[PDB]
Amino acid sequence: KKVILFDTNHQVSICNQIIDAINSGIDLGDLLEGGLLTLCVEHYYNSDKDKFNTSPIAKYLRDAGYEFDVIKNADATRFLDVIPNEPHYSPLILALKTLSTESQRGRIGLFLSFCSLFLPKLVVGDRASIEKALRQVTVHQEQGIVTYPNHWLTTGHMKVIFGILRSSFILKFVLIHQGVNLVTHDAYDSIISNSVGQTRFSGLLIVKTVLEFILQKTDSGVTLHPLVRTSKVKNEVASFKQALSNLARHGEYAPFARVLNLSGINNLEHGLYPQLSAIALGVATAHGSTLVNEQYQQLREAAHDAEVKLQRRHEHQEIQAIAEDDEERKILEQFHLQKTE
Amino acid sequence: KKVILFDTNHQVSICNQIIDAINSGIDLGDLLEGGLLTLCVEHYYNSDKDKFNTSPIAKYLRDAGYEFDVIKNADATRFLDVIPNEPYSPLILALKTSTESQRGRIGLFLSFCSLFLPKLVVGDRASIEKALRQVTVHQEQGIVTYPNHWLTTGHMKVIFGILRSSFILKFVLIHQGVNLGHDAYDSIISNSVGQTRFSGLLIVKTVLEFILQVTLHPLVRTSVKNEVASFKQALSNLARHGEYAPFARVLNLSGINNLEHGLYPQLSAIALGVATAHGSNVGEQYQQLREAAHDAEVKLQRRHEHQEIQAIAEDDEERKILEQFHLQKTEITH
Amino acid sequence: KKVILFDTNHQVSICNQIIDAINSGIDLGDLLEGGLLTLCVEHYYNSDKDKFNTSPIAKYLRDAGYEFDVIKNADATRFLDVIPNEPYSPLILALKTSTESQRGRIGLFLSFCSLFLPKLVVGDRASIEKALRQVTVHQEQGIVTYPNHWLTTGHMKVIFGILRSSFILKFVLIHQGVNLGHDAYDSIISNSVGQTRFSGLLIVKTVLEFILQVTLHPLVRTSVKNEVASFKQALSNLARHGEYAPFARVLNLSGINNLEHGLYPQLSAIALGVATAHGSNVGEQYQQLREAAHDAEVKLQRRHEHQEIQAIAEDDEERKILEQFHLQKTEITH
Amino acid sequence: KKVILFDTNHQVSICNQIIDAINSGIDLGDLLEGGLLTLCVEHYYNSDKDKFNTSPIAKYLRDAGYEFDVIKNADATRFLDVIPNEPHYSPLILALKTLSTESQRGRIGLFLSFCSLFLPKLVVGDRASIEKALRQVTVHQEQGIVTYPNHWLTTGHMKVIFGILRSSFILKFVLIHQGVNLVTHDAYDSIISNSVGQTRFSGLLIVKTVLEFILQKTDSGVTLHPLVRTSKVKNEVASFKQALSNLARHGEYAPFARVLNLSGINNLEHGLYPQLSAIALGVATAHGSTLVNEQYQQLREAAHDAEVKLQRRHEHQEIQAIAEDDEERKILEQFHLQKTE
Amino acid sequence: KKVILFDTNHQVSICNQIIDAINSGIDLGDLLEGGLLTLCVEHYYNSDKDKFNTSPIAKYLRDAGYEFDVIKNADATRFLDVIPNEPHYSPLILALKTLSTESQRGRIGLFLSFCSLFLPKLVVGDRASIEKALRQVTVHQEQGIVTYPNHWLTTGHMKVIFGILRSSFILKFVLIHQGVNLVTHDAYDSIISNSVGQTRFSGLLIVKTVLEFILQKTDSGVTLHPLVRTSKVKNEVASFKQALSNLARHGEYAPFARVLNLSGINNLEHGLYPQLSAIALGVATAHGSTLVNEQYQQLREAAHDAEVKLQRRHEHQEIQAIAEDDEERKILEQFHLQKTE
Amino acid sequence: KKVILFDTNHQVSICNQIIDAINSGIDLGDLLEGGLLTLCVEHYYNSDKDKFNTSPIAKYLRDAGYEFDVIKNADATRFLDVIPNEPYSPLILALKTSTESQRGRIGLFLSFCSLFLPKLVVGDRASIEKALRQVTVHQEQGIVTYPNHWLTTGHMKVIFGILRSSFILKFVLIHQGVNLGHDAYDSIISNSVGQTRFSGLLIVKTVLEFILQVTLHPLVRTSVKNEVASFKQALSNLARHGEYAPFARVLNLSGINNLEHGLYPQLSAIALGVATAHGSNVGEQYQQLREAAHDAEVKLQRRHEHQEIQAIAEDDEERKILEQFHLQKTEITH
């Protein structure tokens, strides 16, 4: 799994032409992954081969099977110059000798920040990811921290970027890494970080709802929600615990295992835990979280109705316990008033 | 605290005229409390005095200082007939001026009032903006439709003041809403009452949920340990109200004047910090305390998520060691 | 500490004469301890020296400083024959002066002595008033009847002094009573020994039951935390006596001089307060402390009763929510 | 369920004639409940209709179905004046025109305090309630805080008062309320309070013995006595917990549910819990509490014999634990002596 | 069970001749127990009959069935003088009129200290006890605190002392008592104490391994090692708990119940707990303790392999818990830095 | 930090020559790290660059600052051919001077190096004395035999320095040893790595096992409470290394300079006291603290043994009371 790196002295110009090809719907084919990596290496590392080779992104990507082969051509200006010659790359070279204007360096991180907006709903598909990206474009452009060209905001262009991000593990990984590991930091980073944050457990909301509502760590032990203590659901809990432990091996990248297609995700499908999912969703909705789900609809409604009653019991009990501690205080204060009297 | 209950044979006629007077902005004065009680008694007890006298609503209403005084005028067809004749007089004049329609209008009216409960203690604007949002939710469902002239600012301001000034009306709706003839007037009132829990008690709620666990939240330990004591004293006053304690600010129940954030300023700021970190009212010397608490809590929640996942992974490591044991122990040697 | 054991062939004759001398108020002096031991060895071991030498009673009696010295005069028919001839002399004279009757008189006598144990450490009057009350209980049951001339003040004063001065007699009865030929002499002695637990140790008992729970009673927390340490040091001295620690005041076991309420005056008053609040010996600077502790404890016990009932009610509320869940989850929709 | 209230200006005279009719064995019939309420309203509220209507007693009695109708007749002196005319009340009016002397106001609370003495054993029956009332009469008259007329102390008079209290929910309730809710207070109140106190769990000693000896609340959880942890008894515990929770709805009045015949008492009968009752009574008697109970006699004796052994084990263990903590202290003090040496 | 005590004024001479008879392989027969007791009474109590009769050793030995009968003969010098005359004791008197030199008083406690060296492995048998005693002789003679005559160190002499100690309950008891109850003390005592210490749980290593590795006392409760929680092993734990409680009655002498043959030891045989023994030995060896043990060899190897993995999990977890507490500290310190800023 | 990896077709020939140079005491200089990595890659991955590039060993080695640089000279038969020609020169000269033998010599060599790990951080002598002891253990088992000229002081000093200076070699052996083609080179390396846990971290180990239980050991409570905080801060730096934290002193992982006993002098002495009491490096002002802690711990361990046995006995007393209950309750009366 080799991926091409283009190294020249006219990097900003070469990079914008890769964006130009992508934006025009030119199919880069089996050169797309290296076209995208060059952008990421240009944006975050100034095309410094030494600075990138020692970075955490390059070390993880090598842990995933990638090996890089740089194509030095420092005397090159146009993206066509670094495309190797072959009648296989000739159809690409044809479309590159066709179709914009030289742009700023900012366009590179403008482009990457635009891609990150598709991450929160990427695993759902074409429509949800684009409808959410447009929602975030308004938020950021209302914030006034960014403005995107209007020709980037048409359905036909945002469909291109969805497909580009969907097929690129490198592009998805780089954005997720930079978004989890923000440091001391432009606001291309803050958009990517906010996008990556909204992507946590995308395609893994069963994990999220169980962790938030069903399981809770204590000192010591991991306790079960009362509605779950039952023979049939207890085995789904055992299987969920096993499967969730498998994702833990990915570390900080575990909440993005569905986005990144990490090893161990087929065991964490909501179908594998029908009862545990319905109860967890029952309990989630009782607090006002989020909804696809009727063979388990009565299980979910019963869990919702029980959880409302249980939380109200917990609130009432917690108030009475404080009152009982206070009555004790008044007796001890009457005690100290009476013993010196 | 005497409150008048009207008993006639044309109760629905008199009740719709009480609603007619309210909607027209007639100030019922010290007769409003009994006008509203009459509506509630008709809707929930069908003007059965005996069924009401032994009811849990009459129990708490008498427990709150009220004594009921029936006016029995079976020879009456309209609301004006059962008003005492004593010249008072300004109310009796304004009544010269409106169709009865259905008994179902009574519970239409009561359900509309309940919509103002979730944000009543915040004030005029928030309560109406919240009620209007609920009108959209309920009218989408098609379980109710409210007359469009009820949805104007000048009409919703009248209903806000009526609910705000009437303890009987607020309590009856809240009572019927905590413990559930199950129509969708009831489900609307129930959903409204549910959203009203801890309205005007946001310091108590966040402290109960996040600060007191009874162990103290880390931000409170180091910071304030005595402010927890003062908070504990004040909150205990509300406990006597039972299941109605989450509504002590809305219902103005005996013991709320003890709950001032001034007695516990730092605990209030820290708790509000922690609330907003989970997705949630003022201060100046304690504003940086609130910013620091929010920023610490988001860091703490991120740490706990990691711990929870690592705890599950280690429990799984332990399970695999024990399961390998039961397999390995049964291995057959020769 | 040498103590004489008499071995003859007429043991029952000599034993009844030892009882005859005691009941007649003859001061046996430094021969009393062995006179009483001889009785106990006859009743519980049938004067079998070997059966006694290896017994748990001889183990603890030697563990307490005693060494036994047998006097073997098989040519003796009466108690006077086995008394050494050394002129002492005042005892030998007073014996000129009374029927043997049954061997069952021996355990009649021992059972009578045990009745003085429950209040022996309180003193002459309380111990006799308690013994007399037990005589009524046992003679009603008809399991025993005591000779009426044993029930006079002048006779019960003699037996009180005999039990009070004799460590061997007190221990033997207490030993046989903790760990149980099961006649009703044994059940009388057992019931007497049971009522003797913590006789003269009422501060220890109430503290152990109510103050140390190991958490501290609220009245002790705020008040004294160091007096608990001194109480803990003193009580530890008694622990070496094992199952006999509740009898350290009665038996005067090594370590009781460390248990002075002066080292823990406040803890003593508070514990006595708490005892009497549950239905139960002196002080002046600490009398209001005892009145306050009693008054607080009755309030605390009333609160706990309420809490216990409310806790059960809430557990039941939780059960109904879960049971409704298992019913509601199985509802069939179409 | 309407009950009559007599309001005049000669209340103390009217009240003493009601007592006069009761004491003479005149059957007041369906006027007895209102005859008794007038006494209670006179004693505690000075016949102030406004002061009574706003009281906690009137609000509870209305919660129980009662509605009052005052009979104003302020120009009346004799009890006959406020009896309405009818040949149904004529037989009562006959006996009222027959049979004492005008007495003090104190007689009213003298009478009520006398009635309260029958509460501790009312639910047991005629003999036990009277034998206990006589026992308390001696205690209070020995205390010298009260003296009762000797003609009140005959069997035929105390049988009348037993029947009067037994049939009157209002009289039983008023005394129990005033006895639980004493405030800052004559000693008619202290007699009634001491009587009401001795009435707690009258007819509910299974509840008392279980609460005191079998169950105990902690932080947190309600623990079972070891002798009870067993399959058969565990279900009686579940049923006892359910039934006891039903009485909790009566609040401060729950210990008097058998005396007051409150809704939920048929579920708390000792027959429903044969094993739990025998073990609890076993454990109670081992500490010296109180005894009707042989199909479960060996269960009770075994529980008594086990509890004696268990408490002695607990006492012995608690002494050794303190000794072990102390040996640790001596080692740490030897430690601090040696580290500076 | 009577045992003879010789009391003269020439005790040190009489005692050394008893040692002389023992060392020469003279069979003292049914006089051996009293020959040995005289030595112990001479060494620890200066032949003070009063000082010994009141000692804890005499009181325990009487608790075990022994009764002493002194043979006064203060005008005697040779051991033969205090042997009573009878053709049954004549064969002994013959060998005593045959076979060393008058020696010091030290020889008495030299002899007793030599005997104690056989205790650590006495219950195993002839070879192990002698091979260990020789190992300790080197340790002490290397320490230079003692030196033993070379003619005591031959196989034929150490076999004599093994048989002497093995048959003598009194000699075994006295040494064990003095070794547990050392006070403020020569170094004959420190050798005997070190020997008695090495004898703790000799013939009871199943008890030791279970107590050290399988069970642990807490506040409060005695917890089971995870590998043991299983149905079959749980019953062996119940039986082990019962049997171990039976030995507890011997107090401070319970670790020596196999050496002293105390009542209750047949219930604590490793055969009675095959699974519990294998798991305990598995867990012991994982920490490096001590090994006779293949029907349960795979159970033992599996326990060893599991325990290594479990301890490493516990070490790793304990490090992470400390790290998590520390991250919390840094957040609270950032908190206090920010709230005043 | 560039490190060279050699890829030829005669890898075993070049690898044995790297071993030949090391054993002959040739200083490879800044080429040693890649000489040793080449050996490890051949043994564990058969010189498969792709299999290595994606391996967990390359992951952590890059995570530690290393970047690999392959030298591809397939036209090479000996180690001299793949050394760069740049005149450095002193190494290239010394190579003029040794049989290849088997590929199994490679894992013979690696297994020999692992034997120095358990005491490497102690120094030259202890590490060799420990390695020699392991040679006896393994050669008795007959699972390996090492060439006798490898067992001389002058040769084992060379291997000590090679392992001590090479992070790559130490890590690879430790990595393969924690998580286990299962030959006995692996079991030797595993047993060596196991004995290396907390080598140079004996304060941490004893504190973790005996002092932090998270409750504090009694000797630490009274004494020092702040030194625990400093110890907790320092130990947390190591936690980032995961399963490799017990090897932070051996591997010199980022965070060990924070673990100085000077920051926690008393806690170090007390823990070392407690360790030796269980059967286990310097100080002067804290030597009596270590003697006192050892003497207290042996007393404490003796007390706990007694408590554990008494706890079991009392649990048994309780069981017999309950079992007698279930027997006695079923007794049949007439």
From Swiss-Prot, chains A, D, E:
The chain holds residues 21 to 367 of 695 of the full protein. Homooligomer. Homomultimerizes to form the nucleocapsid. Binds to viral genomic RNA. Interacts with VP35 and VP30 to form the nucleocapsid. Also interacts with VP24 and VP40. It comes from Lake Victoria marburgvirus (strain Ozolin-75). This protein can be divided into a hydrophobic N-terminal half, and a hydrophilic and highly acidic C-terminal half. The coiled coil region is critical for homooligomerization, for the interaction with VP35 and for NP function in RNA synthesis. This is Nucleoprotein. It is found in: Virion; Host cytoplasm. Belongs to the filoviruses nucleoprotein family. Residues 292-315 form a coiled coil. Phosphorylated. Encapsidates the genome, protecting it from nucleases. The encapsidated genomic RNA is termed the nucleocapsid and serves as template for transcription and replication. During replication, encapsidation by NP is coupled to RNA synthesis and all replicative products are resistant to nucleases.
